[PDB]
Design a protein around this ligand. Structure first.
Ligand code: HEM
Ligand SMILES: COc1ccc(C(=O)O)cc1O
Length: 393
């Protein structure tokens, strides 16, 4: 009743070009079985959205990677938010929601925008730059570690630690094995910066620790919640900004529309998140037998959600494979959906918006002028190198 496929969604060939295989996964049926890894898969928008929005049946506390924490030991102490279910999820979620709240965004927006304008000014003096290292990486690194309250020393561990986290959600392939082999210095830095004395006053980390006296989290929970922001607070933003620049370089007509109305900047970034979904996949684990898309799935089964595929499902999107900066993007699942929907989405959108706004106002053309290189990760989609020439407006 359920089609069995041999597609490996964590193979380098898949990463290099996932879109044909994602169509094969969608068109095979609403629920597939992936024989390579012994997991169920859902690749259409409808089932991915349904799974995300049923946390009782499709839980997160047994891991949102391949590994089932009821069977294997987690590679690090589980996240108190990403790998918790309601009700244990609820109060830590509330703390991060308030720390990264609409009101917090007002306190950081002027500085984030000035830093974006300054970065584009700097890059326009160089002309030919690497839009990953020099822009997608450099700009979030210039604003987010400071907003966290991190010291200057050791920041080189942040992106390697995040890549390790992304690879560790995957199956036990070479990407995951090698990440864990190299992990010790990055984990040691990150865990140490989570302690209250190492977080500068007024930043995100200090604000998490300040919430330890409301009854929502205890002092011993705050280091792990800081760890969540050091895990997730950079690499997907890097990849999303790089994807947006890639899209503007590939679809010059959309750069021209963006230049003509810079207030499209926020939606241009949101469309880039839909189009080149920085988080491609997450897992859930069934807590009971469940019927999903006409399929019966037993208890204790891993279900792989293809978020990038759901964001390109023609059953939900018109011309899904077009980058359209005026698309109604509401409802895409690049940030998830439901109770775990990205608690840092306002930070990511702020960074993406103000960077795309600075490009819209300052740059006339973005031309790829070198070999584009892909960055491979079991969970993240993004580029390693994006050589571009920036022409000033
Ligand atoms: C474009 C950038 C980003 C993308 C594409 C993204 C993607 C996602 C997705 C898909 C989830 C859902 C996980 C699930 O359902 O299991 C999520 C959750 C989360 N994200 Fe983001 N994220 C981004 C930026 C950020 C930033 C900037 C931060 C921190 C400042 C952050 C922190 C978190 C946390 C803590 C969670 C867990 C929330 C929960 O479990 O309730 N993310 N993200
Ligand atoms: C969506 O990506 C993530 C979200 C949350 C965490 C966490 O450690 O809580 C880690 C991640 O890699």
């Amino acid at each position: 009743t359920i089609p069995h496929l041999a597609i490996d969604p964590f193979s380098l060939d898949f990463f290099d070009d996932p879109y044909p295989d994602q169509q094969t996964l969608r068109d095979a049926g609403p629920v597939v079985y992936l024989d390579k890894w012994n997991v169920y898969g859902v690749a259409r928008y409808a089932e991915v959205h349904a799974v995300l929005n049923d946390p009782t049946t499709f839980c997160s506390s047994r891991g949102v990677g391949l590994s089932d924490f009821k069977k294997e030991k987690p590679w690090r102490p589980p996240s108190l938010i990403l790998e918790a279910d309601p009700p244990a999820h609820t109060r830590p979620r509330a703390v991060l929601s308030k720390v990264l709240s609409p009101a917090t965004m007002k306190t950081i927006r002027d500085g984030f925008a000035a830093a974006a304008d300054a970065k584009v000014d700097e890059l326009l003096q160089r002309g030919c730059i690497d839009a990953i290292a020099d822009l997608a990486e450099a700009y979030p690194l210039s604003v987010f570690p400071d907003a966290m309250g991190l010291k200057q020393e050791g920041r080189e561990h942040l992106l390697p630690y995040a890549g390790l986290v992304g690879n560790a959600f995957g199956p036990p392939n070479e990407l995951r094995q090698t990440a864990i082999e190299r992990s010790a210095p990055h984990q040691a830095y990150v865990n140490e910066q989570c302690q209250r004395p190492n977080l500068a006053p007024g930043g995100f980390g200090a604000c998490i620790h300040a919430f330890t006296d409301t009854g929502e989290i205890t002092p011993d929970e705050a280091p792990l919640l800081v760890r969540s922001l050091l895990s997730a607070g950079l690499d997907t933003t890097v990849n999303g900004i790089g994807a947006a620049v890639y899209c503007l370089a590939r679809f010059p007509g959309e750069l021209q529309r963006l230049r003509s109305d810079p207030t499209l900047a926020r939606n241009a970034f949101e469309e880039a998140v839909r189009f080149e979904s920085p988080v491609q996949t997450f897992f859930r684990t069934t807590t009971r037998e469940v019927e999903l898309g006409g399929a019966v799935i037993g208890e204790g089964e891993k279900v792989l959600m293809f978020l990038g595929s759901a964001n390109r499902d023609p059953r939900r999107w018109s011309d899904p494979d077009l980058y359209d900066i005026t698309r109604k993007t509401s409802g895409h699942v690049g940030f998830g959906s439901g109770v775990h929907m990205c608690v840092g989405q306002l930070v990511a959108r702020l960074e993406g918006e103000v960077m795309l706004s600075a490009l819209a106002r300052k740059v006339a053309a973005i031309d790829i002028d070198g070999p584009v290189k892909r960055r491979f990760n079991n969970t993240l989609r993004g580029l390693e190198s994006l050589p571009v020439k920036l022409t000033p407006a």
